[PDB]
């Protein structure tokens, strides 16, 4: 298990003097969804490129924490599911528009359901069971990235989580609990005058997985005094 965030102070949506659209748009409707595909190229050793087909791209570059992963997954029919940016995203092809991502790859064959587990989410503004709801995958081991995107693409779309200017909420995180192992992510931007999408999303780059069932979700919030 990874220890809670009080010795790991969070970010504050106000001590970010950038803009909040640079965040809400990563957890807005658009994303990289794809089923059963094999990397067709590789630019950097920790990368794979997928040709797959809304509006500004088509070839996806997936980035991992390791030189491995790229291996493993290079040439496997997989699913790809994560956030994705274009701003700070270049890469060459060898296959005589471009989007980028991190992690988000699970193996397709032998991971499907019928049958589509719903994971419940408990939201805690201030510290109070102030909302809930479920998200739904259709697969055995799911990427936390994938999970987190969902939980987010709800909150935003109903409880203003992300605005453009700053945030309603001071801090906020998303905890993931399996049986003997829990862990969290910080929903809040890097402190300063402007915010790095690639830096941020680079948290996933490890490709962390849960398991459709054994997993609950807890989203903790606070407000700006």
């Amino acid at each position, epitope marked *: 298990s990874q220890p809670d965030p009080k010795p790991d102070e969070l970010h504050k949506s106000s001590k970010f003097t950038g803009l909040m659209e640079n965040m809400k748009v990563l957890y807005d409707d658009n994303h990289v969804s794809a089923i059963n595909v094999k990397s067709i190229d*590789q630019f*950097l*050793y*920790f990368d794979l490129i997928y040709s797959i087909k809304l509006g500004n791209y088509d070839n996806v570059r997936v980035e991992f924490k390791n*030189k*491995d992963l790229a*291996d*493993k997954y*290079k040439d496997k029919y997989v699913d790809v599911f994560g956030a994705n940016y274009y701003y700070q995203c270049y890469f060459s092809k*060898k296959t005589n528009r471009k989007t980028c991502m991190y992690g988000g790859v699970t193996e397709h064959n032998g991971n499907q359901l019928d049958k589509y587990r719903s994971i419940t989410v408990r939201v805690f503004e201030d510290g109070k069971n102030l909302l809930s709801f479920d998200v739904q995958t259709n697969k055995k081991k799911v990427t936390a990235q994938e999970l987190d995107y969902l939980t987010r693409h709800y909150l935003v779309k109903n409880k203003k989580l992300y605005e453009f200017n700053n945030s309603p909420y001071e801090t906020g995180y998303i905890k993931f609990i399996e049986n003997e192992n829990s862990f969290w992510y910080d929903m809040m931007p890097a402190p300063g005058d402007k915010f790095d999408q690639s830096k941020y999303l680079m948290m996933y780059n490890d490709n962390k997985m849960v398991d459709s069932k054994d997993v609950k979700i807890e989203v903790y919030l606070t407000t700006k005094k």
Partner: antibody
Amino acid sequence: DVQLQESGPGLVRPSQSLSLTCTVTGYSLTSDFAWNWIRQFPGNKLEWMGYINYSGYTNYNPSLKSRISITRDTSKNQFFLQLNSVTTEDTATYYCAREAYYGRAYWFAYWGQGTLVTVSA
Amino acid sequence: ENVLTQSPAIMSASPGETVTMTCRATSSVSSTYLHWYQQKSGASPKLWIYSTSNLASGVPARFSGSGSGTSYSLTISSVEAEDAATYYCQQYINYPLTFGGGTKLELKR
């Protein structure tokens, strides 16, 4: 400690294959790192061939993907290289090396003695 | 793919002289993924600097490495005769992984 032993037929005929062995010692082929074939030509230029990795996974110099095989016998703990349709431009010294890494930093720590291969009729 | 380019091929030096070889990449690496190997003739290469500046096991700190972007250098302060060798920079990251074509180092007499 981790040594690396090349071997193979000193001479291949144009168009044959070229199976080579690296025999590892002091370290298990399956605990970590990549295991690479690199060959150096006359005039010394060094070309990477590719590596069988720590979990039996490959990645090849695309300049050869098609004629290139890197496989392993974990039970004799050694790795191998197969080279197709060799042409004389394949005469070279062959090293097999395992890597080390800090962070995103991968390099080649240990190298084998080498192993000349004349490709000739 | 991302060819790495070494200047000069050969370079003489009298023992005590301090000298510098270069490594010009196309593309352009971060300093971390930029290694040098040393090869004394009749022998395998061997790591010398990794991540550009960082000496390997038992290499005399006469050796140093600066570089960045697409320009990188390898320096030997007082140059002993046991320094005669060929030196290869090497980039990771790129795929395919690349070597530059030696700088040979010979002694003056």
